[PDB]
Please model this.
Amino acid sequence: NPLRFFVLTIFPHIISCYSEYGIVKQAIKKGKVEVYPIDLREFAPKGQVDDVPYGGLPGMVLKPEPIYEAYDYVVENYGKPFVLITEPWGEKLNQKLVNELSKKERIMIICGRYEGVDERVKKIVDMEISLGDFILSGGEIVALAVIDAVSRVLPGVLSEPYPVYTRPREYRGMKVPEELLSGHHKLIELWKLWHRIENTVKKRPDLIPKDLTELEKD
Amino acid sequence: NPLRFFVLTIFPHIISCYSEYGIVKQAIKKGKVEVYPIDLREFAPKGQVDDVPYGGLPGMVLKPEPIYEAYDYVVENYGKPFVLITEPWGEKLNQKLVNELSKKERIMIICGRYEGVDERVKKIVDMEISLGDFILSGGEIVALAVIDAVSRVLPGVLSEPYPVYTRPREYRGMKVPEELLSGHHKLIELWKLWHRIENTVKKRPDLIPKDLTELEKD
Model:
């Protein structure tokens, strides 16, 4: 009962492709996760997987039938999945959800597109990724982010997981902080850098620009 | 002619695979954007992209040389890029940025990995995608989101930019709200469901689950 992911999308290759590298690929290779891209079009008549919405709107919406059909196919061939939906405007998860999800066994991620998914689908939706603050054209990227975040918090995948520096001791004249270089007589000093700088970057995510509008209304 | 992206990554194919579909492909098709995946490995001087960090930390950090070399190449062959970095733990952008970025000509996105990027890279970084509340194993997914978001608000790409329903009028016994259904005698009534339901799903991102441990914390 390795964690199985079932991603519903009109672009399955994007999912296959992301699973061939990094931690997702490591997770799969170690039998800790499986990722199944389900092509919505294989559950639809003339690939018409979207249609003109009602009440006159400028675009198209994903139909109920192919999504329900693909749901059934998954419940039948694998167990009943925990159904997650990523809409074109929804991308605001946190470590909480990731952890929660990491404890599951079967996950179906519906990748929203266009003007969204027909509400009748919500009847089999368990969770919806809340609005984020920017717009994508589809849910794939969020699905991958989910798959990514979850995969790396699974036991057996990740071995053992302030500014950081690496080998090149001096490059283009830029030199690593001598603190970080010696350090038995730095055990506590290296821990100085650690803090003396680990907080500066925490209250400084990005300057001043919008900081004058947010702070200025608190 | 044509907003150009340069994506520094050790997983080029992830980027090339996302560009073959959706809005990014359309933008590329129409000549509104170009996406150049830049393989970090092909720019590693002594063939080494990552190395052990100083101050003794559990892992590896991306080295400066290959990123600086890649940057240099971009500058010589295409023009100096506005440099953006997405770190393994950084995913909180907004429609604000997306728009600002769409007005640019050259963007290079340095995809983070491991324990991060040697700080010395920061000297040529213009903007940093702030922390986001969840952790990814790399910046690829954030890079793609950025490419996606920007591409869709470009002029010439998208043909002219509450619950939704589509053409199956009745399915599995589930029927579309009649009320959205006819309507001259609904030109205001369709605007009722529009609102009467447009607020429920806005103050109800989720449910009761985190509200008790966060709404009461403040």
